[PDB]
Design a protein around this ligand. Structure first.
Ligand SMILES: NC(=O)c1ccc[n+]([C@@H]2O[C@H](COP(=O)([O-])OP(=O)(O)OC[C@H]3O[C@@H](n4cnc5c(N)ncnc54)[C@H](OP(=O)(O)O)[C@@H]3O)[C@@H](O)[C@H]2O)c1
Ligand SMILES: *[C@H]1[C@@H](C#N)C(=O)[C@@H](C)[C@@H]2CCc3cn(C(=O)c4ccccc4)nc3[C@@]12c1ccccc1
Ligand SMILES: [Mg+2]
Ligand SMILES: [Mg+2]
Lengths: 416, 416
């Protein structure tokens, strides 16, 4: 009799991560846990077949069941439209889901005692709090075909003020233009999530913007964070001997680089994307990073791997060549999802299982069994030999064996 | 004798950088070089007095004389408006100048063998080619006060059509919105500058975008770079055994982090700003970096010191206290400017002088003569003693002495 897991929304994906996703369910989840699994295939072919309706339905299912576990998916471009003979260049499924759910994507490296960093000073963790709504990820962009005016207008519903601003008057040739926005309520939830995360970890909080350039747009993020801090969190930060400060983004990335870690970094959507990949790599690998969307309701989460479909690696699998893809981030999407499901259901057995799989994953790497990427952290990529790492399947087998052992010993450890 | 320098546009700046800028002219340039100097004071008080007209005039002077050297300037915020009792919160002078001139700002670290990197693998240089025009630095942003529609419109100059895109319909509360653009011709010049830089250095070229998200806006940068490569540069890259690749920005930053350097990184305006500060800091010190704007005409340049005005030291200097200000980036703005002036005028003596001052600066630090910041990079700030560094004036004197020596030995080396 397996553990009673409960209701979980799973989103199947593409390429290398799709392969890995099936191996994880079969070898690490299904032998030990029984779930009411709400499966949505977000594979590029199924999104094309359903005119991207499957993505909207999966997002609505997460709203209802409170816990999502998502596989990395292809965001189609011109080359992808050609490859899969798509009806349209479908929008990012992550963007669709995040737009519907809202919240903050909290990203952090998965640390192993034997893995060396690329950044010497990072002795404490860096938690990135990426705002999951608006800006470039819900923008309107277009090609300007030739000379003419691009204007941006605001028309109040309950006002008079049709305000028209000239963006640019193209006098010779064309180019490109775009409009983007953000919402006060979403910014307020992002500020609250950031202050709360810093207080739960007991670390200082830094918000990065470019308010010297985008005086109104970024100035608003700065003003909302400062206002919420002064009125609702300042005394709490002072009590834990921590602080909150705004920094310019270019200063912030340089500060982070020369720091020792141990802080929460509130990032605007775009910066959170870019810098989350820099922080994961700085600590060792993109395969070694947790990614959880924490919704503003405080009950709903969508767990995923911060990295993508690992297309480069999938192209090697396609050629029947050997692959060594790190499945740890994909595994931690399941464990973080199951841990949240356990917390909602007060399921001590599911919570034990979720944590045990995380320990098994870290212990296996710490025991010297790892994928090529992690072996390159220790030895340097040119000094890496076949004997130093395990392939994708080999690594999954070792994890399955170690998981079986950890769960057997835990059961035996139970006293009368 | 004195080297006939020629026509150079200089832009004076603010705080500690303004002091250091003067020490440089007096001790390192004026004793050896005679210049037709076109001086524009871009200090915050003079920009206020001229309603920022001095900035536009300096930019027009650079267009005319083809070479400009710029000191670091204050971009005023609310606290700066209060401090200097400004009439307005003046726009960034760098933004104004770059908007008028156009081109690409090439950023590269200034390497000293004895200064430790924070990024272990960077054994070869990373050259960031920052597109200097448009996007966030020529944007129109505003606060949305409440419910209502934000739209962006395009009207061709013939007035025979009008395209209206909905950016967002605010239904509850307000937020923020912005319009930004770029121009095809500016993108084309950025692509050419990037391919040419890679071919002159003999390194591969990488362009970073977020074209999976901004399909039209970033897709255009991607299409223009790919088109120009295939038609005008591919055979040249193949001949030097180098390549041109497009990567997504978040992938790119992770790639750069784990690389060994030795590539050209074509960055969009914003990414260039952020990542050049991450890279400069990764090599050792933020202020150990060159920043040269190469204009599309292939004749005009603006070299600058792309760091802050060092307020913390300026305060100490005002109080008659001891300061230890790194002047290297400000020195290299002069040497890169003078080297370009020499190249335009076929002045072998000016070219020799420009290079000699660069060698002198690197050799002095490498000989163990440096400012507090660099001493902290080697020993760590708590382990730094007064004997480990030189003050602002002491460091300038050492460079002046070493420059006098290098130039005397070079004159003696001339055969009868
Ligand atoms: N959450 C998501 O659904 C998500 C996120 C990002 C991207 N994407 C999509 O994924 C596709 C490919 O994206 P991308 O190549 O830009 O980004 P990516 O999949 O994160 O991978 C880029 C590179 O990072 C390394 N890497 C990433 N995950 C790894 C892992 N688990 N183990 C080892 N190495 C790993 C590899 O480096 P080396 O090649 O040097 O080994 C890989 O080629 C695109 O269609 C994109 O839209 C989706
Ligand atoms: C300089 C110093 C002195 N004297 C001091 O006491 C600090 C307040 C100070 C902090 C900021 C700063 C910047 N620099 C630079 O010289 C510089 C110049 C150009 C680009 C980047 C940096 N020095 C300092 C001070 C410092 C910094 C670090 C360690 C010791 C002193
Ligand atoms: Mg990303
Ligand atoms: Mg900057």
């Amino acid at each position: 009799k397996k553990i009673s897991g409960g209701s979980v929304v799973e989103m199947q994906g593409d390429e290398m991560t799709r392969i890995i996703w099936e191996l994880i369910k079969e070898k690490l989840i299904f032998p030990y846990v029984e779930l009411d699994l709400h499966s949505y295939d977000l594979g590029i072919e199924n999104r094309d077949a359903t005119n991207d309706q499957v993505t909207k339905d999966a997002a609505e299912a997460i709203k209802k069941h409170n816990v999502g576990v998502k596989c990395a998916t292809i965001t189609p471009d011109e080359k992808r439209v050609e490859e899969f003979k798509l009806k349209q260049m479908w929008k990012s499924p992550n963007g669709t889901i995040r737009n519907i759910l809202g919240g903050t994507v909290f990203r952090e490296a998965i640390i192993c005692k034997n893995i060396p960093r690329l950044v010497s000073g990072w002795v404490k963790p860096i938690i990135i709090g990426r705002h999951a709504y608006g800006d470039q990820y819900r923008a309107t962009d277009f090609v300007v075909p030739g000379p003419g005016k691009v204007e941006i207008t605001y028309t109040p519903s309950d006002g008079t003020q049709k305000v028209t601003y000239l963006v640019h008057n193209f006098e010779e040739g064309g180019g490109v233009a775009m409009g983007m926005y953000n919402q006060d309520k979403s910014i307020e939830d992002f500020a609250h999530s950031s202050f709360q995360m810093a207080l739960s970890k007991g670390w200082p909080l830094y918000l990065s913007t470019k308010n010297t350039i985008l005086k109104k747009y970024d100035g608003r993020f700065k003003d909302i964070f400062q206002e919420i801090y002064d009125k609702q969190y300042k005394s709490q930060f002072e009590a834990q001997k921590i602080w909150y400060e705004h920094r310019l983004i270019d200063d912030m990335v340089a500060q982070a680089m020369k720091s020792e870690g141990g802080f929460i970094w509130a990032c605007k959507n775009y910066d959170g994307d870019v810098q989350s990949d820099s922080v994961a790599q700085g600590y060792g690998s993109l395969g070694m990073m947790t990614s959880v969307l924490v919704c503003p309701d405080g009950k709903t989460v969508e767990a995923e791997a911060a990295h993508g479909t690992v297309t480069r690696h999938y192209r090697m699998y396609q050629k029947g060549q050997e692959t060594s893809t790190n499945p740890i981030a994909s595994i931690f999407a399941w464990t973080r999802g199951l841990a949240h499901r356990a917390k909602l259901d007060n399921n001590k057995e599911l919570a034990f299982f979720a944590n045990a799989l995380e320990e098994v994953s870290i212990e296996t790497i710490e025991a010297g069994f790892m994928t090529k990427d992690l072996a390159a952290c220790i030895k340097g990529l040119p000094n890496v030999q076949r004997s130093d790492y395990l392939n994708t399947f080999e690594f999954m087998d070792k994890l399955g064996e170690n998981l079986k052992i950890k769960l057997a010993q835990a059961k035996l450890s139970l006293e009368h």
